[PDB]
Design a protein around this ligand. Structure first.
Ligand SMILES: CNCc1cnn(-c2ccccc2)c1
Length: 165
């Protein structure tokens, strides 16, 4: 199972790790992708996860969008985890850089409650432009299922742990 995580709460764990490497090692039931509404996995966590699947994640995602249309900001869909996990839960956090409502971050994290255990990044962090300290706070106050957070950046990981209330 998951190893080397620091326990933050009864159900939230955190590790300084590359979520792609973490997923390839653990092969969790669910890996969360930091998706956009179009499932266009160009960069950040999404680009990295998609590149690890040899673009199979993007091919599957394009078929999903062709059939269903875009997701909502704050919404999600379950697709294959390919070589990374049994499933990938594509979750759309608000992208502050595109002027999206930060209040939708709680709705985005609520998607995690449909899965007993997940490997995930901090939603809306990184290239999505939100404050990762705020994202972790919303995560701990919203997710009730077991969430293993992978934080790529060591300096950000240290700041998140050291400032965690
Ligand atoms: C083998 N490394 C793949 C890779 C590239 N980028 N990231 C990454 C970036 C931001 C957030 C999480 C992960 C992982």
């Amino acid at each position: 199972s998951f190893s080397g995580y620091l326990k933050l709460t009864d159900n939230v764990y955190i590790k300084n790790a590359d979520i792609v490497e973490e997923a390839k090692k653990v092969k969790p039931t669910v890996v969360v992708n930091a998706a956009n509404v179009y499932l266009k996995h160009g960069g950040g966590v999404a680009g990295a996860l998609n590149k690890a699947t040899n673009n199979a994640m993007q091919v599957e995602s394009d078929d999903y969008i062709a059939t269903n249309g875009p997701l909502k900001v704050g919404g999600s869909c379950v697709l294959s985890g390919h070589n990374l996990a049994k499933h990938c839960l594509h979750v759309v956090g608000p992208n502050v850089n595109k002027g999206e409502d930060i209040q939708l971050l709680k709705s985005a994290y609520e998607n995690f409650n449909q899965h007993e255990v997940l490997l995930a990044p901090l939603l809306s962090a990184g290239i999505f432009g939100a404050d990762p300290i705020h994202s972790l706070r919303v995560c701990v106050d919203t997710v009730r299922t077991n969430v293993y957070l992978a934080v790529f950046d060591k300096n950000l990981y240290d700041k998140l742990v050291s400032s965690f209330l």
